[PDB]
């Protein structure tokens, strides 16, 4: 049966949405707004009253004192809106090349594994959204493979810290140590620490 | 003690949200070894350049600089429905995006219009020299500037699969002038 | 004494200006002349203005701007000396500007 | 056929191109750059590095 | 004049710079694919819809 309305077109709505993604800067924010409320409406996740991260309890102890503060200075507060923004960013299209709020931590003691473990758990609940920032997160990960335990860092950097995927296949590792910076995200450079080649 | 209510009730959430009205670009990351954005650009042959994704610092809004510390609260201070179950009705989201797709198409209308006028288009401004005989303010030959050619003619005959216009010979080719122009 | 090339009653002087100024040697100009665009940001920065000063004062003003633009050192190389004044193992995260 | 530099002749010119600066380029301000303390003093290394 | 307001248009606002404004005068803007170097490619079907 006829409706009857002016048929909703496939094209145009794709072009006028594409031009708006060059002039109108807050397009991204409006795309998030519509699909973040759907997460909060479906009632999928909600913050609780009390805290319970690192205990298993009987802590506060004298030996734990060092490990206690390391996890405490890593704790994010259960803000209802901050949780929803993570579930929504997973699907929503972006226009600005966002990168991580960077941390300066020289891996000194065994209690510093509470930083590398954070980058693991972030790479599981959000596998996409981890692709875009894989290079800047690689830059602060090389300190774990150098200061913490060398020899491998000495033989891995020997090959180089960056490659190009081209040659119609294969990989072209450049035998030189360079940093990431994120500014070269959209080019022909993949962070070499995520290669998989042995 | 989380994974069950994390890979069932939360898994069917993305499974549907992956195909909405305003979500379009592929952000897939199942092979970190090889994947790129493949960005497009808005360019005119008359000196203009605007990308869709570009490098810049944080904007005046919370979309840039992704916080990585938002992992510990969602492993401890977050009760799930622990699986009562609520299904959000399709009405509030289908119409929500339908009106956002309206604002864009109605807000981009002015600058796509007033811009179009000062472009001319579908014209050439040419001149014809009378090869004696009897004139007529017509016939002779048809001259056009190279810049007018590249703007209108070149980007249009380029859409189809025709080999670019043949170069005029220093020698005489009154034979194949139209034969190569036929292609 | 050129911008009045057609506004003075004094007849003799008029024909003269519109002869040596019309000349195939010199030419007068005023206003915006050209623009230098930006690499990454993509905005107008250093604009040239066909100003109405004299060669003696205009020469001095250019020595300044050129030595400001040929520094090639951003305001971010400031935090590399701001750090030489604290505990040897500290660091900063620069609000990149370029 | 080039341009004879006007900074060396006698007769004074009265109009010329001056390289100005727009309202985007700004000089001599501040940066809200932040610090992060070495956290512990005991395990710092001035010795070599 | 047709109500639909433009709070910001073409202008990009970085929080550590202020409010920079671009031009809005395109012409025959044919959305085309960019190669890694920063060059317009062309029309190779089976890749670009």
């Amino acid at each position: 049966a006829l409706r009857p309305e002016l048929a909703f077109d496939h094209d145009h709505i794709i072009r006028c949405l594409m031009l708006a993604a060059a002039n109108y800067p807050r397009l991204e924010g409006i795309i998030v707004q519509i699909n973040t409320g759907y997460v909060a409406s479906a009632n999928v996740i909600r913050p609780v009253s009390e805290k319970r991260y690192f205990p298993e309890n009987l802590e506060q102890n004298q030996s734990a004192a060092r490990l206690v503060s390391a996890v405490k200075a890593r704790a994010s507060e259960a803000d209802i809106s901050s949780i929803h923004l993570a579930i929504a960013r997973e699907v929503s299209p972006m226009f600005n090349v966002h990168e991580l709020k960077k941390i300066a931590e020289s891996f000194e003691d065994p209690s510093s594994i509470v930083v590398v473990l954070e980058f693991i758990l972030f790479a599981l609940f959000f596998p996409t959204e981890f692709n875009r920032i894989k290079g800047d997160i690689q830059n602060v990960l090389l300190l774990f493979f150098s200061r913490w335990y060398p020899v491998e860092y000495g033989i891995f950097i020997q090959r180089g810290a960056t490659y190009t995927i081209n040659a119609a296949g294969e990989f072209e590792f450049s035998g030189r140590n360079e940093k990431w910076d994120q500014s070269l995200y959209l080019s022909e450079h993949f962070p070499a620490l995520f290669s998989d080649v042995p | 003690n989380i994974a069950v209510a994390h890979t069932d009730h939360l898994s069917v959430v993305y499974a549907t949200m992956s195909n909405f009205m305003l979500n379009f670009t592929n952000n897939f990351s199942g092979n970190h070894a090889t994947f790129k954005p493949d960005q497009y650009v808005i360019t005119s042959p008359e000196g203009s350049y605007k990308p869709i994704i570009e490098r810049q610092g944080e904007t005046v809004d919370g979309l840039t600089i992704i916080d990585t510390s938002i992992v510990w609260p969602i492993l401890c201070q977050c009760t799930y429905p622990l699986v009562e179950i609520v299904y959000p009705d399709p009405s509030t989201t289908l119409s929500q995006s339908l009106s956002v797709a309206q604002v864009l198409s109605k807000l981009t209308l002015p600058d796509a219009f007033i811009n179009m006028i000062l472009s001319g288009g579908d014209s050439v401004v040419m001149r014809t020299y009378q090869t004696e005989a009897d004139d007529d303010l017509d016939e002779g030959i048809r001259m056009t500037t190279y810049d007018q050619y590249l703007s209108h003619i070149r980007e249009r005959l380029h859409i189809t699969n025709v080999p670019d216009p043949i170069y005029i010979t220093g020698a005489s080719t009154p034979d194949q002038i139209a034969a190569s122009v036929q292609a | 004494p050129a911008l009045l090339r057609d506004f003075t009653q004094v007849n003799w002087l008029n024909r003269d200006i519109t002869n040596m100024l019309q000349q195939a040697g010199t030419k007068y100009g005023l206003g915006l002349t050209e623009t230098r665009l930006d690499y990454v940001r993509l905005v107008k920065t250093i604009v040239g203005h066909a100003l109405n000063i004299d060669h003696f004062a205009a020469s001095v003003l250019n020595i300044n701007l050129r030595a400001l633009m040929e520094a090639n050192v951003t305001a971010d190389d400031r935090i590399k000396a701001l750090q030489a004044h604290s505990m040897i193992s500290t660091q900063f995260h620069g609000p990149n500007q370029g | 056929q080039v341009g004879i530099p006007k900074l060396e002749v006698d007769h004074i010119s009265f109009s010329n191109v001056v390289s100005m600066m727009t309202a985007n380029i700004r000089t001599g301000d501040d940066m809200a750059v932040e610090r992060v303390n070495p956290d512990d003093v005991r395990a710092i290394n001035i010795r070599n590095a | 004049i047709t109500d639909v307001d433009s709070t910001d248009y073409g202008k990009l606002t970085l929080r550590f710079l202020g409010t920079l404004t671009r031009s809005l005068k395109m012409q025959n803007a044919q959305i085309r694919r960019i190669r890694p170097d920063g060059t317009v490619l062309r029309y190779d079907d089976q890749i670009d819809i």
């Binding site: 405490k72 200075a73 890593r74 704790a75 994010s76 507060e77 803000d79 901050s82 709020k101 | 610092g57 944080e58 919370g62 840039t64 600089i65 916080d67 510390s69 938002i70 609260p73 | 305001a75 400031r78 935090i79 701001l82 995260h93 609000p95 | 000089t27 001599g28 301000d29 501040d30 940066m31 809200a32 750059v33 932040e34 610090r35 | 929080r15 550590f16």
Partner: peptide, 16 residues
């Protein structure tokens, strides 16, 4: 309490 914030941080001030 360690609260979750997004953008860059503000502390000390530079000088020309």
């Amino acid at each position: 309490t360690k609260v979750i914030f997004n953008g860059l941080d503000v502390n000390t001030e530079v000088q020309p």
